DNA sequence: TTGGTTTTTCGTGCCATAGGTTAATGACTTTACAGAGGTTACGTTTACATACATTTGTGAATGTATGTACCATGAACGTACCATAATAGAAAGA
């Protein structure tokens, strides 16, 4: 369940904006040894910091979407 | 008396005078594409107040730390079932 997961996130980041994945890969830490923190995303990508929230608030509003997350909803009870 | 060349009408074929539907480019006109201009509702960038965390001192839990000065003089301090046959070892008589 473990290695189906790891595709089905995969699908998920390929099926939406390619710049969105990259924040969600290099946010929590996917893809990548470290977890940045959100100073440490400031430096790299842009100085705005609140532009980053609204990302995530955007990210989140097209993710409780239930059609994309149809595979998802039954690795909710694990 | 019978076959075949000759000749003239007559409906049919060729030529000419009339008169009408319908090809031409166009001129259409209608639909489609191309031009700017005012308005909407976002998306990114910026400052500011308050919060969980994380960084410090301070009161209690254990822990090794060295000694106690009538006389204490050898034992296993209770273990245990005793199968079977290849290969060497330390001696004993040949």
Redesign the pocket.
Known sequence: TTESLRAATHDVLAGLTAREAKVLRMRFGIDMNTDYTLEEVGKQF??????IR??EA?ALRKLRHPSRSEVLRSFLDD
């Open positions: 842009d100085v705005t910091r609140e532009r609204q990302i955007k």
